[PDB]
Every structure is written in structure tokens, then in C-alpha cells.
């Protein structure tokens, strides 16, 4: 209440009546109240000192503010800033030299005070002496060395060229050295840092500045193309000069950025068109098909660039009959490059000079990125975007577009080395034992949820810099929290709740379909592997998922699935709900999970007894396999069993049923030869 | 839903303040930011597929919003004439949206939008 | 007239509609035009003409609104799912077959509605017996306010109705009939050049250039004649 | 060579440089645009190309309503094949004259020449609806009837409704005969 404030002020004037001197009381009354505040604060005279000095200074009373600050520094029960005002006053007035020296001896990183000292010296070197002392204190100060050279022909040019060839990243030292040379008379690292810089600035303006396909990023691409042509025509890099490999890597990255700009122009205008993806495929191919520079920086840049270019060169044309047509049509001597150049740089960069007509493309041919090369280059690009949920979900969705589940275990054993592969008990909601399968299952579920949301444009994935967020806020938060836990008063409610959810504990919010996709992926991944002590764990985990789902599939009798009014971790609609039809399928898959989990440890008898319920093709196949491995050299009357099961399998292969993890062509020939020779 | 509806009310209010001050540039920027009306001929379909997802109070503001946006495009075209293909494309997109919209608005507003289209043609 | 000065469609509609259907007939005291000139007042006949012009304009705007709804009512194409299977191929084929009849039905609807609305609009543009928004009896006392109301109605509806006719003609591809709006305006009988200023005739001339563009594209001459 | 090369590409900055490096270059470029009208400088920056163009519809687009009205008056005087075409041409001429920036006296004199021409055109316009079907001529697609032809039609026996107004017309149409 301002009334209570004014009451305090009444009491304060009374308290200056009572405590006659009342310096602090008067300063506080002026503080309670600019004109009367200044007068009362002058009477009271850090508050009084600063108020009076700033008021006088801004009024132009340099001498009066000097008086105030110098008196406060001379009484000095609490004062710091007074030296600056005293120095500036004595300057505006032989005298200010000592005060600027004091400012330097309290902070030799004083550019403004060094300039004022230079002005004092010109009104009266030795600023180069103060700067030589600053260099003796903080010798890495190339800027202090340049100031000393400026104050100082021999030593000025030496200590100007030295620091210029030490940083070169600022025209300051360069112009200073040139001015020193002119006043006295009257390189490849620079190009490398400029090219490395320009690439980063292009990508920054492209992605985080969010240029709407306007001059913002396009002018930077013009600067990048100009630097590329400049370094090309000037330093046509030979074998020994590292500018060779640097220039080739920047060539590939230039084509990559050009492809990105074409895509972004299409999307900004209306949508990824049919007319801005073909030269973009040429751009991404002209980045993948440049040789690996064989330096960690360059190697990782090539890794990332080839990985992304391969993902985009397979997503732009999943179907064939595009690479060769693009190569033979959209590239030529002058026409293809001119149609490629007008799109990038509209009538601002001529064709013959200052453009891409100089660099050749006719060397390139047809080469689709391979699926194992792509896996290894994804593993290599996992090095410079460590633990980005955006990058992980991007790569996961792209591999999902390739119709194949990604090698999540390789990426995760790269990112997090020490996270255990499993946990002892899945019945415990314990946070400090994050298992590899928990986070891989989180990755998979986030991947499929983002897939459904994006489904609900010829490139479907919209490469990393240009697109929006892929994951939801809940999963982003959990990822931040678990990453903070692993890669270390920690607020871990999200960790504990989402572990309750992921292990499918007492109460979860997700419905069957999520767990089913989890269990299928786990089954295939563990079955592919040969190691006994990983197949055991993986089949245990997938059978765990299906067994926790077992009673959930039982409540589906014309009633609610699981009442979730709010979405805890994953809630979509019109995709999850398992029809009563698919109950039978899931029960049969649960039975084969039971049987194989029983079989892959040594309880082969109940393995067969369990397989002896389902009547699918994989059941016959696994029973035949276990009978064979049982009786390689045991009995002969057990072969009729292989005969009969594989004959049923033949009857079911007649229809062309490909449900077997290994197709019939090699299985039925093997068993057919085994039965015929032993018959 | 209601929270974002309030956000929409605040956005429309600020854009109306700019339109009442005469800020055609910021008005166009805010109309593009709210992404409710067809700014491009192909965006009429997307905005019409989204329009059924709005609250009825938004169907109450869409008429004035469309009138103001058409007038803004007309004023930008006037500036470009007195100092236009994208402006005419935006006028055609506004025509498509206002015509295929499920909100049977006042025929007089459609008549004035057609008059602006003509004076732009 | 006060409601038309602000273009309040529902307001003017109420003002004209809640009025009885029997007003003019019950007001006509003498039917034989000889005595009907005497019994007919320079204010009563003028108000009857005002009601007739109000009804004509109301029809010419309501029909235009209905035609404007039907113009963008037109049907959309059947969705193409790339690499469609047998079922999707057959269903999209049936959707295309149905859409090819939906567009024809919408074309017939466009023809009927456009014809009716254009007929009403041409009726309003060339109201008989002196033109719309004009008194027929000159023996009325000074009523400058209402006279200026009718003047403003003409000056605010003539180029407006002309713009509506031009837009409807462009929509129905009547480029020649839209370019004949020039003759409709310059007609010495109607003097429609007196209700539209230089700016209105300039916009209508740009619309005539547009219509001539469509005609020359359709291979007819600038006047709609065979080249 | 240079003006065709710089017109093949979008190198209008190159054409502007070549133009800057030339004496009497603006008058040369304007004459070159006039010469290659329809060969270079075409619309199909666009509005600059349209203004580079230096004929009734084109005069309307150029906003010279007076020149358009002159051309339309000449076209109406030449148009006889379709009386409807002649009338529409005179109407376009009148509209262009009204939308022109002509001074009071000049616009009034043009309007007087328009009123005399309209008095000449209105004589035939009153062709009777019985006489049109009796002569089995089109409703409007009969040629521009001459004054003697209009007199003969208004005085013919076929026009059964021959009245005082028709007689006044077939007597007033004698001042447009010529070579009496």
C-alpha cells in the first residue's frame, strides 16, 4: 500500500528531525521518492554516490561527478566504481595517465581504458608498455598483442603479422597489420577456417534461423558458392595440400546444402513438388558419390553427409528407374547446371564465372547406397549428434520407411556403453537399473507413434534440419530425464512412471498393439542372434511382454479396453484396438513363444508338448528341427515324424505361405533329401 | 481445445488491433501465422478440412477475418500498383475458401470480396 | 433505403417481407388507368415503384448468393492412392465414374441457377418505365432527402450489379455476354454511364479485357465474332 | 547479336550493362523494343515488359481513352457488315470518350459528332417487328441499312402499320442521302 509507503516517509522525515544528521535516513527518503531525490541524496552524501554521480555525469557535469566519485573513493567505506569516473574526468580535463594505469592494473583486459590511455599519450608509446605487461600476464591475448603493435616498424609488424597468422578470424588484426605496413613504408589456414566457418553458418541460418526459402539462407548459399569457386580457381589443391581433401569434403557438403535448399523452397512455397526433388536427388547423389577423405573432423563430416545423403537418395526414389534417368536428363554440359543454378541464385550470379559451371560432374555414374554401407554410415553419423532424440527418431523412422527395423542395439551400444543389457527382476519399479531393452522399447514405441501421427509430399521424412519435432513432449521429457540419469536431488517421477509403463507393471496406460510390436521386434532380433546368453534374455523379455498382455487380451468381451481419460505415455486411436479376430492369432503366437522359450534352455520334452497345440507352419518347422537335432544318430523310426511334419509343410507351401522365417526353397530341399536318403 | 481457442481469440484481437492501426504488413504476417484461412490455392482444401475442427465461436470470427484479409491483399496490391501475381493467387485462394467453406456467411461479404477480386483483375 | 445504405440483407428483407402481399392491390382505389392517374398519388405510386425496385434488387442479390454457393459447391476429384491394389483400383474407378456424373449434374445446376440469376440481374439493371430507384410521377413535392436516397441507391447498385453480372458471366464462361456489358452501360436508353464514374468504368474495362482474353483464347474475336 | 543473346536468357542485368555502355542507348533500346514488338520484350518485371510496349483495346490498356475513342469512331464508321457491330462500336467510342480526360469543349464537340451519328444509327434501329418478319431478315444480323434502304423499307407496302412516325422517319432520312 502506497499509503503505508507514504506513512514510512512521514516517519522518515520525523526520523531526520529526531536523528539530526540522518545520512542513511535522508538517502533512504530520497530513495523512497528525481529532483528532490537528487537534492536529498546530495544532502545525505554507494546509493548517494552513484545517484549524484550518474545524475551529474548525464547532465554533463564531469567535474562535479568527479568530485562526488573521488570523495566517495577517498572516504572508501564502500566504493568500487569511482576510479572510472575519476579517470574519465581527469581525461576530459599528465593526470589521467595514472588513473588509466590503475584501471589497467586492476584489469589489463581494458580496451576502452587502453584507448583512453592512447589518447592521453597523444595529448602528452608506454601504452605499449602497459600492453606488454598485459601480455606478460595473459600472453595468449592476441588482441592485447595487436594493441601493443598499434601503439608501437620491426616489432610492430612482427607482433601484428604473428597474431594475424595466429587467428586470422577477424579483419581487425589484418587491417592493423596492413596499416602498420603502409605507415612504416610511407593464409591457407585462413581459407580453411573461412570454408569451415561458412559451412557452419550456412547450416545454422538454414535450420535454426528457419529461413522461409528467402534471402536469409539463400544469400549465405551465395557466399558459400563464391568461396567455393574462389578457393577452387585460386588454390586448385594438389595432393600434399590439405585444402585438397577439405575442398572435396566442402564440395560434397555444398551439394548437400543445395539439395536441402531445393527441398525447403518446395515446402515453403506449397509442398515438396515434383519439380524440385529431381535436381535434389542429383545434389544428394553428388554428395554421397564423392570419395571418403582418408582428420577426425573431416571423417565425421563425410560420415554424416554420406549417411544423410543415402537415406534421402533411397527415400526420394524407393522405386528404381530414377537414378539413371536423373543422371541422363537433369545433368549436361551447360543446360543442367544452368537450370540448377538459376533455381539457387536468381540472376545474381552469372553462369560462366562465380558459379558451378567450373566444377565438373560428368565423372559420376549409377551407384545406389548399399544397405550395409548405410548401416555403417549411420553408426558413424551417430558420433556428432550424440543423444539427440530428434536424430534418433529421425534415423529410426527412416529405417522404418526402408521396411526394416533399424539396428537399434548397435546405435545404443555406441551411445550408452555401460547400460546393462537386462535386469534381474521385471516386477520392480526401480529407476537406477535402466536396461538396454527398456530404452530400445521406448525408441521403438516413439518411432511407431510418430509414424502414425505423421501418417495422420514425396519425401516423407523431411530431413533433420528442415522438419518439425518428431516426438511428443512427454517422451522428450522422459528422454531428457533418463539421459541425465545415465550420463551423469534428481526429480525422477517421469523415470519411475514411465518404467512402470514400459515394463507393463500393475497399471499401464498403453494398449496391446504397442506391446505386440515390442514383442515381435524382440522375438526377431533375439532369434537372429546366435549367442545363447542373449537369446535367453530376449525370448524371456518377449514372452514377458506377451504374458503380461495375456490377461489384457482377456478383458475384451464387449467392454472397455483400459480406461485412460488422460494420456500417460502413449494414447492414439483407431489403430490399437485388437479385434476379437486377432485374439486367436496372438494366443497362437503366445503358445509358440512359450514353446520356444521352453526349448532354448534345455527342456526339450515340454518344448515339443507345447508346440503340440498350435497348428501353423512354424510349429511344424520347429518340431522337425528339434526332432532332427535330437536324433541325428539316435533312431530311425523318429524320421517318419520329420517325413509327416514336412509333408504337411509341403501341403501348406503349395499355397505359397511365406510365414517361415526361412523360406521353403532351402528347408524343404534339405529335409526332402534327408528323408529320401534315410528312406 | 478451449485453451487454444482462447489463444485464437488473443491472436485475432492483436491482429485486429494492427488492422485498425493500419498495419498491413504485420496483419498479413499474423494472418499467415494463425494458418486458418487459405493463403494459397492448394491450401483451401487443408484449411477447409481444418475448419470443421474449430469451435463455433471461430465460425463466428471467420467472416470478419476473411473480409479483413481480402482487404489486406487488395491494399497490398494497391501499394504494388501505386509504387501482384501472388496477390491475385491469394485472392483466388480466399475465393475458393470462402466458397467451399461450410459456413453460409452473409452474401454481402461475398459480394464485396468479389468486388475486390474484380478491382484486382 | 436506410437499411440499403448499410447493406443489411436481413434487415431490408424483413422490411420488405413482413409488409403484406396485399398492400398495392388494397391501396389501388381506381383500376382504370384514366382514373388511376388521378387516384394514384405522386407519392403513393412512387412508393409502389420503390417497393417494386426493392423486390427486384432483393431477388437479384438472393439469386446471386445462391449461385455463389452453387459455384463453389462443385464436386472434387476422386483420390488417387499411388500403386493402388485391385480393390483400390476398382473403387477409384467407380468413384471417377460417379464424379463424372456429379460434375454433369453440377453443370446442369450451374446452367439453371446462372440463367435465372442473370435474368433477374438484367431485369434489375434495366427496370422498365424509367429505371429502378427512380420515381415515375414528377408531380411530387420536394423530397430531397428521399430523392438523394434513391440517387445513392442507383450510384451504389449500378456498378455493383454490373460487377456481379461480370463475375457470373466469367464463371459461366459467358465472355461475349460479359463484353456486351459495355453496350449495356453505354446504352443511350439506360444511360448507365451516368451511375458509374471513371474508376468504375475503368474496372469494368479491365474486366472486359479479361473477358476478351477468354474469348481470344477460345478462338473467337474480341467481339465474340468468328475470326 | 547482343540484344538477341540477352533476350534468350534472363540476363536483363547484362542487357542493362550493354545499354549503360552506349551513346543514345535509351532511344536505341526504345526503338529496338518498338521494332521487335512481339519478338522480344513480350509478357509471355512483367509489368515493366508490358509498359515497354509503346488498337482500341491496347489504347484502353494504355489508358488513352481518347485515342481508343478515335479508333473506335473510325471502326464504327467502317463497320457496316453488322449493324449490331457498328452500334456496339459507337457505344465503345462513346464510353471511351466519356472516360477520357478530354476538355469540356473537345468532349462536347466529340459528343455532338456522336449525337449526329447516333441520330443516323437510330433511324434503322426502329425497324418494326412485323416488317422484320415480313422481310424475313434476322433480328439483328441484317447489314447496316443505308438511308435510301431505310426509306424504302419504311415506305414499303410490307410495313402494314405505316403511321405518322414512320412517315416522319422516311422523310427525315433524306438529309443523310448525299449527292441529292
Automatic annotation (TrEMBL), chain A:
It is found in: Nucleus membrane; Nucleus, Nuclear pore complex. It comes from the Eukaryota. TPR repeats lie at residues 46-79. Belongs to the NUP153 family. This is Nuclear pore complex protein Nup153. The gene is ranbp2.L.
Automatic annotation (TrEMBL), chain C:
It comes from the Eukaryota. GO terms for biological process: mRNA export from nucleus; post-transcriptional tethering of RNA polymerase II gene DNA at nuclear periphery; protein import into nucleus. Transmembrane segments: none annotated. Plays a role in the nuclear pore complex (NPC) assembly and/or maintenance. Required for the assembly of peripheral proteins into the NPC. May anchor NUP62 to the NPC. Involved in nephrogenesis. One of its GO terms (molecular function) is structural constituent of nuclear pore. Belongs to the nucleoporin Nup84/Nup107 family. It comes from Xenopus laevis (African clawed frog). The gene is nup107.S. This is Nuclear pore complex protein. The keyword Protein transport applies. Part of the nuclear pore complex (NPC). Forms part of the Nup160 subcomplex in the nuclear pore which is composed of NUP160, NUP133, NUP107 and Nup96; this complex plays a role in RNA export and in tethering Nup98 and NUP153 to the nucleus. Does not interact with TPR. Interacts with ZNF106. Keywords: Acetylation, Centromere, Chromosome, Kinetochore, Membrane, Methylation, mRNA transport, Nuclear pore complex, Nucleus, Phosphoprotein, Protein transport, Translocation, Transport. It is found in: Chromosome, Centromere, Kinetochore; Nucleus, Nuclear pore complex; Nucleus membrane. Its main location: nucleus. The keyword rRNA processing does not apply. GO terms for cellular component: cytosol; kinetochore; nuclear membrane; nuclear pore outer ring.
UniProtKB/TrEMBL annotation, chain D:
Belongs to the nucleoporin Nup133 family. It comes from the Eukaryota. Residues 1-141 form the Nucleoporin Nup133/Nup155-like C-terminal domain. Involved in poly(A)+ RNA transport. Involved in nephrogenesis. It is found in: Chromosome, Centromere, Kinetochore; Nucleus, Nuclear pore complex. The gene is nup133.L. This is Nuclear pore complex protein Nup133. The chain holds residues 856 to 1045 of 1140 of the full protein. Forms part of the Nup160 subcomplex in the nuclear pore which is composed of NUP160, NUP133, NUP107 and Nup96. This complex plays a role in RNA export and in tethering Nup98 and NUP153 to the nucleus.
Amino acid at each position: 500500500s502506497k499509503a503505508e509507503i507514504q506513512r514510512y516517509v512521514e516517519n522518515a522525515q520525523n526520523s531526520a528531525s529526531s536523528p539530526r544528521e540522518k545520512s542513511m535516513k535522508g538517502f533512504l527518503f530520497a530513495r523512497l521518492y528525481y529532483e528532490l531525490a537528487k537534492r536529498s541524496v546530495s544532502s545525505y552524501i554507494p546509493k548517494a554516490h552513484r545517484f549524484l554521480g550518474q545524475l551529474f555525469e548525464i547532465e554533463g557535469n564531469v567535474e562535479k561527478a568527479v568530485g562526488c566519485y573521488k570523495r566517495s573513493l577517498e572516504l572508501n567505506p564502500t566504493q568500487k566504481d569511482l576510479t572510472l569516473r575519476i579517470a574519465e574526468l581527469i581525461c576530459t580535463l599528465g593526470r589521467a595517465e595514472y588513473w588509466v594505469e590503475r584501471a589497467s592494473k586492476l584489469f589489463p583486459g581494458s580496451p576502452e581504458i587502453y584507448r583512453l590511455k592512447e589518447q592521453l599519450l597523444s595529448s602528452q608509446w608506454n601504452q605499449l608498455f602497459d600492453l606488454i605487461q598485459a601480455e606478460l600476464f595473459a600472453r595468449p591475448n592476441d588482441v592485447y598483442v595487436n594493441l601493443k603493435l598499434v601503439d608501437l616498424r620491426l616489432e610492430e609488424a612482427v607482433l601484428h603479422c604473428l597474431k594475424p597468422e595466429r587467428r586470422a578470424l577477424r579483419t581487425d588484426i589484418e587491417w592493423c597489420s596492413c596499416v602498420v605496413r603502409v605507415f612504416k613504408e610511407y593464409n591457407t589456414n585462413m581459407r580453411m577456417i573461412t570454408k569451415e566457418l561458412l559451412l557452419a553458418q550456412c547450416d545454422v541460418v538454414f535450420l535454426t534461423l528457419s529461413k522461409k526459402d528467402v534471402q536469409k539462407s539463400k544469400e549465405a548459399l551465395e557466399r558459400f558458392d563464391q568461396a567455393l569457386l574462389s578457393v577452387k580457381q585460386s588454390v586448385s589443391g594438389t595432393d600434399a595440400s590439405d585444402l585438397s581433401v577439405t575442398f572435396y569434403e566442402m564440395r560434397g557438403h555444398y551439394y548437400m546444402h543445395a539439395g536441402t535448399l531445393l527441398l525447403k523452397m518446395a515446402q515453403s512455397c506449397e509442398v515438396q513438388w515434383k519439380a524440385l526433388i529431381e535436381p535434389a536427388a542429383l545434389c544428394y547423389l553428388l554428395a554421397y558419390q564423392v570419395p571418403k577423405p582418408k582428420q577426425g573432423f573431416l571423417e565425421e563430416l563425410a560420415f554424416d553427409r554420406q549417411s544423410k545423403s543415402g537415406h534421402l537418395l533411397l527415400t526420394l526414389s524407393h522405386g528404381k528407374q530414377n537414378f539413371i534417368s536423373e543422371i541422363i536428363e537433369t545433368f549436361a554440359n551447360q543446360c543442367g547446371q544452368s537450370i540448377l543454378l538459376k533455381f539457387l541464385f536468381e540472376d545474381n550470379l552469372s553462369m560462366q564465372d562465380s558459379f558451378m559451371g567450373s566444377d565438373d560432374i560428368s565423372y559420376v555414374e549409377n551407384r545406389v547406397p548399399d544397405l550395409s554401407e548405410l548401416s555403417q554410415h549411420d553408426n558413424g553419423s551417430l558420433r556428432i549428434h550424440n543423444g539427440d532424440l530428434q536424430h534418433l527418431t529421425w534415423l529410426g523412422l527412416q529405417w522404418h520407411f526402408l521396411s526394416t527395423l533399424p539396428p537399434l542395439r548397435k546405435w545404443l551400444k555406441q551411445i550408452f556403453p555401460r547400460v546393462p543389457q537386462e535386469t534381474s527382476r521385471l516386477e520392480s519399479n526401480i529407476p537406477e537399473s535402466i536396461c538396454l531393452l527398456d530404452l530400445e522399447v521406448f525408441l521403438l514405441a516413439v518411432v511407431q507413434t510418430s509414424y502414425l501421427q505423421l501418417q495422420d509430399n514425396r519425401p516423407r521424412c523431411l530431413p533433420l534440419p528442415i522438419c518439425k519435432q518428431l516426438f511428443t513432449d512427454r517422451q522428450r521429457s522422459w528422454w531428457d530425464a533418463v539421459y541425465s540419469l545415465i550420463t551423469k536431488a534428481k526429480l525422477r517421477s517421469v523415470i519411475q512412471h514411465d518404467l512402470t509403463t514400459l515394463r507393463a507393471q500393475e497399471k499401464h496406460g498403453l494398449q496391446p498393439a504397442v506391446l505386440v510390436n515390442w514383442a515381435r521386434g524382440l522375438h526377431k532380433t533375439g532369434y537372429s542372434l546366435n549367442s545363447f546368453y542373449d537369446q535367453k534374455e530376449y525370448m524371456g523379455r518377449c514372452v514377458h511382454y506377451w504374458k503380461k498382455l495375456l490377461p489384457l487380451l482377456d478383458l475384451v468381451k464387449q467392454k472397455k479396453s483400459i480406461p485412460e481419460p488422460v494420456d500417460p505415455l502413449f494414447k492414439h486411436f483407431h489403430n490399437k484396438d485388437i479385434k476379437v479376430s486377432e485374439v486367436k492369432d496372438l494366443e497362437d503366437e503366445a503358445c509358440i513363444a512359450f514353446a520356444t522359450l521352453d526349448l532354448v534352455d534345455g527342456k526339450t520334452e515340454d518344448a515339443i508338448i507345447a508346440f503340440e497345440s498350435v497348428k501353423n507352419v512354424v510349429a511344424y518347422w520347429n518340431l522337425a528341427l528339434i526332432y532332427q537335432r535330437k536324433a541325428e544318430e539316435i533312431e530311425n523310426d523318429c524320421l517318419p515324424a520329420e517325413e509327416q511334419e514336412e509333408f504337411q509343410e509341403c501341403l501348406l507351401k503349395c499355397k505359397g505361405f511365406l510365414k517361415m522365417i526361412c523360406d521353403e526353397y532351402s528347408a524343404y530341399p534339405s529335409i526332402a533329401t534327408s528323408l529320401p536318403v534315410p528312406v | 481445445s478451449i485453451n487454444s481457442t482462447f489463444y485464437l481469440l488473443l491472436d485475432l484481437i492483436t491482429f485486429f488491433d494492427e488492422y485498425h492501426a493500419g498495419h498491413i504488413d504485420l496483419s498479413f504476417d499474423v494472418i499467415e501465422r494463425l494458418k486458418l484461412v487459405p493463403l494459397s490455392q492448394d491450401s483451401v482444401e487443408e484449411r477447409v478440412a481444418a475448419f470443421r475442427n474449430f469451435s463455433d465461436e471461430i465460425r463466428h470470427n471467420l467472416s470478419e477475418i476473411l473480409l479483413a484479409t481480402m482487404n489486406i491483399l487488395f491494399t497490398q496490391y494497391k501499394r504494388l500498383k501505386g509504387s501482384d501475381s501472388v496477390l491475385r493467387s491469394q485472392a483466388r485462394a480466399l475465393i475458393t475458401f470462402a466458397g467451399m467453406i461450410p459456413y453460409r456467411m452473409s452474401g454481402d461479404t461475398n459480394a464485396r470480396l468479389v468486388q475486390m477480386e474484380v478491382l484486382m483483375n | 433505403r436506410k437499411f440499403l445504405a448499410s447493406k443489411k440483407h436481413e434487415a431490408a428483407k424483413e422490411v420488405f417481407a413482413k409488409i403484406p402481399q396485399d398492400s398495392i392491390a388494397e391501396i389501388y382505389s381506381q383500376w382504370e388507368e384514366q382514373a388511376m392517374d388521378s387516384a394514384l398519388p405522386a407519392e403513393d405510386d412512387n412508393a409502389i415503384r420503390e417497393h417494386l425496385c426493392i423486390r427486384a434488387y432483393l431477388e437479384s442479390h438472393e439469386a446471386f448468393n445462391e449461385w455463389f454457393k452453387h459455384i463453389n459447391s462443385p464436386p472434387q476429384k476422386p483420390t488417387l492412392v499411388g500403386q493402388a491394389s485391385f480393390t483400390e483400383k476398382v473403387a477409384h474407378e467407380h468413384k471417377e465414374k460417379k464424379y463424372e456424373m456429379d460434375f454433369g449434374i453440377w453443370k446442369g445446376h450451374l446452367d439453371a441457377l446462372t440463367s435465372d440469376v442473370k435474368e433477374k440481374i438484367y431485369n434489375v439493371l434495366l427496370f422498365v418505365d424509367g429505371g429502378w430507384m427512380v420515381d415515375v410521377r414528377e408531380d411530387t413535392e420536394e423530397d430531397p432527402e428521399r430523392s438523394h436516397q434513391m440517387v445513392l441507391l442507383r450510384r451504389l447498385c449500378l456498378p455493383m450489379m454490373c460487377f456481379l453480372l461480370h463475375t457470373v458471366l466469367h464463371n459461366t464462361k459467358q465472355y461475349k455476354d460479359c463484353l456486351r456489358l459495355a453496350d449495356i452501360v453505354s446504352s443511350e436508353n439506360q444511360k448507365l454511364y451516368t451511375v458509374f464514374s471513371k474508376t468504375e468504368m475503368r474496372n469494368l474495362l479491365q474486366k472486359l479485357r479479361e473477358s476478351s482474353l477468354m474469348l481470344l483464347d477460345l478462338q473467337l474475336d474480341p467481339l465474340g465474332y468468328e475470326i | 547479336l547482343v540484344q538477341i543473346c540477352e533476350m534468350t536468357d534472363n540476363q536483363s542485368r547484362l542487357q542493362r550493362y550493354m545499354t549503360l555502355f552506349a551513346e543514345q542507348n535509351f532511344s536505341d533500346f526504345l526503338f529496338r523494343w518498338y521494332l521487335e514488338k512481339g519478338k522480344r520484350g513480350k509478357l509471355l518485371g512483367q509489368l515493366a515488359a508490358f509498359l515497354q510496349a509503346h488498337s482500341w483495346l491496347h489504347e484502353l490498356n494504355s489508358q488513352e481513352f481518347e485515342k481508343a475513342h478515335r479508333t473506335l469512331q473510325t471502326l464504327a464508321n467502317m463497320e457496316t457488315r453488322y449493324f449490331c457491330k457498328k452500334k456496339t462500336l459507337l457505344g465503345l467510342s462513346k464510353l471511351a470518350a466519356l472516360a477520357s480526360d478530354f476538355q469540356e469543349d473537345v468532349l462536347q464537340e466529340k459528343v455532338e459528332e456522336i449525337a449526329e451519328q447516333e441520330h443516323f444509327l437510330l433511324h434503322q434501329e426502329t425497324l418494326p417487328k412485323k416488317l422484320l418478319e415480313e422481310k424475313q431478315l434476322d433480328l439483328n444480323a441484317m447489314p447496316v441499312l443505308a438511308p435510301f434502304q431505310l426509306i424504302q423499307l419504311y415506305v414499303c407496302e410490307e410495313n402494314k402499320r405505316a403511321n405518322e412516325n414512320d412517315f416522319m422517319k422516311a422523310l427525315d432520312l433524306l438529309e443523310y442521302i448525299g449527292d441529292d
